[PDB]
Amino acid sequence: SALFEPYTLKDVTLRNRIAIPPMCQYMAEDGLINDWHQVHYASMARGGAGLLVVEATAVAPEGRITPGCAGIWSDAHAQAFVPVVQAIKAAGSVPGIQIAHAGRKASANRPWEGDDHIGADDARGWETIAPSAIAFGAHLPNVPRAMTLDDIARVKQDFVDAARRARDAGFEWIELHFAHGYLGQSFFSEHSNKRTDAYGGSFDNRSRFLLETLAAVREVWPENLPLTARFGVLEYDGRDEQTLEESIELARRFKAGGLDLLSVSVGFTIPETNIPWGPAFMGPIAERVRREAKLPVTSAWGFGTPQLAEAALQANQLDLVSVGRAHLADPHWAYFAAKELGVEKASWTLPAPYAHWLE
Amino acid sequence: SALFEPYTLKDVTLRNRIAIPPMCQYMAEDGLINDWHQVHYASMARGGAGLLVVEATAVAPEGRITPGCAGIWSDAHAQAFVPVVQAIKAAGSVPGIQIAHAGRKASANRPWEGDDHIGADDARGWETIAPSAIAFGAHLPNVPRAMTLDDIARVKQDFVDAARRARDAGFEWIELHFAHGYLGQSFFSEHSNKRTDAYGGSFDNRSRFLLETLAAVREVWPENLPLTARFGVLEYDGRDEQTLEESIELARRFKAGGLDLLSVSVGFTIPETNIPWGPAFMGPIAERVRREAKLPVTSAWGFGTPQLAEAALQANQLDLVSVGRAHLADPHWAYFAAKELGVEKASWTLPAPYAHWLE
Ligand SMILES: Cc1cc2nc3c(=O)[nH]c(=O)nc-3n(C[C@H](O)[C@H](O)[C@H](O)COP(=O)(O)O)c2cc1C
Ligand SMILES: Cc1cc2nc3c(=O)[nH]c(=O)nc-3n(C[C@H](O)[C@H](O)[C@H](O)COP(=O)(O)O)c2cc1C
Ligand SMILES: CCOC(=O)/C(=N\O)C(C)=O
Ligand SMILES: CCOC(=O)/C(=N\O)C(C)=O
Ligand SMILES: [Cl-]
16 A cells, blocks of 8 residues: 555655644634643544644744634743644654744634634734735635734744744644745735735745745754645636746745645635635646656645545655545544555554554 | 434433443553543543443452553542543543453453463562452463452452542543453352352352442442443353343342443353354343343444444433444544434534534
8 A cells, every 4th residue: 555655754754644734723722732632633643644744833923813723932832732742753653733824814713603804893803914915805804914024024033933943842844834825825926915025026026935934944944854835836716827837936946945845735815716626636736746846745635535545646646645634533544544445454553452452 | 313312310411322331441550541541532532422431440459450451449540530531521521430350350461462361470460369269261371369258348348449539530420340251240150150158159149249349339429420330141151041131130139229220241251152243232132131120221342333323222222322442443433423324413523623624
């Protein structure tokens, strides 16, 4: 089974090709994770996945999506992650973390509490920042404040500080969240970046925030640990051909800037899109990025069955398969995939107190 | 769905009829549970089961099965369970514990480390006790020491002390382990009880240790919390008709002694048996116990498919369906059952951070 071949990137070895992608839990308070996350991540790591990327973790308070999002903007926040890192490691999985800034999509309600921007009368909300003072729209109508040059310098430092905190907490894998219409993605997209200074206008200027943030993180992130990013390479906004070509060129510059692997996703920068949802629909897009940027990739959004995950590898589209919702439904999904794929001693994807009885 | 009707017993209400039966994890050290159990139990409780009965927990060190078994023979041991109790309650499940004494099956290796008796001279092994100085045989050759009347008094008091500690840790449900060939079961079975004093020989005498332990525990266990027991009602030794009839009579005396529910199982007292290798063979047996002893019952051994569990409840065979190994494979099995049975808002069998996305 290709899905259960180990994978080595820099000096880190994943025991299989199953990655749990970042998945916000909305259960933190003031950015501080707690027993919800401890059990959530430990249980999934024991389920057998080779890599567990902890949810989008805010580099700054206003970079949270919701009042329930995790943060790593202080050392106490980072210390809260230590037992999570150690629990993922004890299960034999590799602990990773996605550090993020929600940009204009910040200051929103939890998904089951409206999923929409928090109103100005609500005391829980806050002012959002973004490259330009233009709203996402739809259920996220709050217009963000346009960032100053000092904002840009401060946020980049927040990414540096968060990467250093993630490193010191013991994460062996970091993912910069440059996707899904949050801050980084919105600097790259002309839909949301209306700037005329050095951070908007041209391709170089729109790339500048992401390339500089990557460069600043690379200076503090160890060379022997994978430095990755999630990036939306197309929007399904009717401009996919040119957007994908620009996104792949940026991925080439990420590679030259020391990025080890690209988590290929959709931009979600604006609501006015037509995303063709279907099983493994990102397959050919991830493969094109993989081949044209010559960079290892993972992807998500419909690979969450054993056969689809395996086929994505057999087809040389992905190096790692990210399986998200299936792991919320079944924290031991990796074990389920091992069985479904007829892996030898499949039950031993799990720790002995389970494996012995399921063989 | 009958499986997702709530169930009320004394002052406890289970949100559904799915019980997680006790399942030894063999991960404790000197009886002390740890982060293995914390995540294991909290994750399963979040999976949606209405009742989680924590594994066989030894009332005394020599009553462990293995060096990895949990114990509750001191207040420090009981304190270790408090976070487990509270995590199970926080997920909306009801915390239970099975208190146990392995009898002549004690001092054995973990199942995946040989599963056989450890010699008492071995630093990890110890001397076993039983109603009669007769070995189980096969891979459990250690001959136990026949218990004196003072031994009987000591062990019953250990059950009492353990029930008090379980109450103080916050357990809302207790199960006496009188099954599976351990101490209590072996007092009841003529195969293992060769005593001629007041605790062997007749039906009354063989029943005495179990009835006296129940009575002693009944004194300290709160009237408003279910007092339950697990008992092997037949052995598949060719004496099943006479054995089951005596077992149903003991269930009647259990009820008269204040037992609230009986977990019906197999004896496993000796190895020379022909136990059915198949699912749900206990259904009609448990139904007979339920109807002839007029006592609520649960059972296990192969009910871990949603349709089988639903069928056992529709047939009035069980009041609760115990689903064990399926929860080792999938801690969210209760959610999987909700889906398969077409329960409305099935995803909300799970907490919101999962439920919202699985709709
Ligand atoms: C509850 C939930 C939270 C998510 N949070 C994040 C996140 O914090 N960062 C991110 O990059 N993607 C996030 N995603 C997107 C997932 O990482 C993944 O791409 C998505 O679930 C699709 O993959 P799947 O079909 O296997 O579920 C989230 C998805 C879900 C369902
Ligand atoms: C790993 C494991 C540990 C078990 N430990 C106990 C136990 O401690 N006490 C008990 O009464 N039964 C124990 N059993 C028996 C189970 O509680 C249950 O009766 C058995 O798994 C049959 O149910 P199932 O078919 O749903 O798995 C254990 C079973 C397993 C698989
Ligand atoms: C619309 C896609 O955005 C995401 O997946 C996300 N984070 O990146 C969430 C849901 O928190
Ligand atoms: C074979 C029947 O015995 C059991 O089920 C058991 N405990 O009761 C264990 C720890 O396996
Ligand atoms: Cl000890």
